[PDB]
């Protein structure tokens, strides 16, 4: 039970019913829980580039030594503040890559730089830092693995649904839409483009998988369907909000992160980072958004770190 | 009008007021303890 009045926002034209409601007190506590860590003081951007001072810099080549050191301090607070520099570094040998966390972190740098430079259709000018996902934890709190669901006897094939699962916001819809849609790239559209039957082979069961994914997307951003759709015509882009366009690119962004950045790290990640199917903990909308329509309520962290952008 | 004689209403009132005051007393003790432990204003 909650108490009135809720916070409200009008999304669509008056009377169409596209409106958002939220709890004011939960918003205030969420805002408290999504504070951005204050950016480090600016460093001197002069002197030799990191490419010519250090021994094994493969990504951050063009940073000055000051900007490079500043970046290492920042990522330590964002990822491994309790452990410190040596979470990713062999003691007494900064150049060595002979610890799995450094190999992973190097690709994470490329992940973030690709996000900040190439996916502005999604992350705009706000961008992402290590903090967006890690939040001061080496292992992101909201990573996911393929969910096997409840146990069945050996003579009954699991249905993948009809179970109370948080992943689809506690509906009984197919409870793992992440693997088929945010890892693999199965088709999400099911609505026909013609009034009369004859040219739409999509199925009712595909509708349920898509519906399950949309619960997860909505739940991951803390919004209702009307944040992106006019639900009298879910398929109709002309009646949707610009957030739907953003969400479209974000789905493809998430696919790129898991297939090209996370999955190739599976063999070097320890078994503790893997699910029952051997797959690595990886990325969904929840991993960055964490139940907010914008990660950290849109806090601009990446802009204060030039090393978080490509070339 | 309620069935109660004027003396019964006198006796019920005496017992009602003494009991309500004692309950209010328990309420005050509990709110003092709560204020000592967790002042809310």
């Amino acid at each position: 039970c909650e108490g009135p009045p809720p916070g409200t926002e009008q999304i669509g034209y008056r009377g169409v019913g596209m409106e958002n409601y939220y709890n004011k007190r939960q918003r205030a506590l969420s805002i408290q829980a999504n504070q951005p860590v204050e950016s480090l003081p600016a460093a001197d951007s002069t002197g030799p580039k990191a490419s010519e001072v250090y021994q094994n810099v493969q990504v951050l080549k063009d940073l000055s030594v000051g900007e490079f050191t500043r970046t290492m301090v920042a990522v330590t607070t964002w990822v491994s503040p309790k452990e410190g520099c040596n979470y990713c570094h062999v003691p007494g040998n900064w150049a060595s890559d002979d610890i799995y966390t450094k190999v992973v972190s190097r690709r994470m740098f490329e992940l973030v730089r690709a996000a900040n430079s190439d996916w502005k259709a999604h992350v705009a000018e706000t961008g992402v830092t290590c903090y967006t996902c890690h939040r001061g934890n080496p292992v992101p709190k909201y990573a996911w693995v393929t969910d096997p669901g409840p146990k069945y006897p050996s003579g009954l094939k699991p249905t993948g649904q009809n179970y109370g699962s948080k992943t689809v916001a506690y509906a009984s819809l197919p409870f793992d839409p992440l693997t088929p849609f945010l890892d693999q790239a199965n088709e999400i559209r099911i609505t026909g483009n013609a009034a009369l039957a004859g040219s739409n082979p999509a199925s009712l069961k595909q509708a349920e998988w898509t519906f399950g994914l949309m619960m997860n997307i909505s739940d991951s951003l803390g919004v209702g369907c009307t944040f992106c759709h006019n639900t009298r015509a879910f398929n109709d882009w002309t009646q949707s909000t610009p957030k739907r366009t953003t969400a479209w690119y974000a789905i493809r962004h998430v696919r790129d992160i898991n297939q090209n950045y996370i999955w190739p790290l599976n063999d070097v990640l320890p078994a503790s980072r893997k699910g029952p199917y051997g797959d690595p903990l990886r990325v969904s909308c929840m991993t960055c958004h964490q139940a907010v329509n914008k990660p950290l309520y849109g806090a601009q962290m990446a802009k204060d770190y030039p090393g978080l952008y490509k070339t | 009008l309620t069935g109660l004689t004027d003396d019964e209403a006198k006796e019920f009132h005496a017992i009602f007021m003494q009991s309500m005051y004692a309950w209010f007393g328990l309420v005050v003790i509990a709110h003092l303890l709560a204020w000592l432990y967790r002042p809310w204003l």
């Binding site: - | 009008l1 309620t2 109660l4 019964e8 209403a9 009132h13 005496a14 009602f16 967790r38």
Partner: protein
């Protein structure tokens, strides 16, 4: 108060008043506890004096 306040029981039924008080008080007490637990004053999940699940 007034010397003749006792006459209130010539107008209102003593038994119905009592039961209504008992019903109102139990409901208000359940309601107020719920209201307080939903605020910053929550005394159960404040990890005071300690968090006992972090002890495990």
């Amino acid at each position: 108060m007034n010397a003749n306040l006792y006459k209130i029981w010539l107008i209102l039924d003593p038994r119905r008043v009592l039961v209504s008080i008992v019903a109102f008080q139990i409901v208000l007490g359940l309601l107020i506890h719920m209201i307080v637990l939903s605020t910053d004053l929550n005394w159960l999940d404040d990890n005071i004096p300690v968090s006992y699940q972090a002890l495990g």
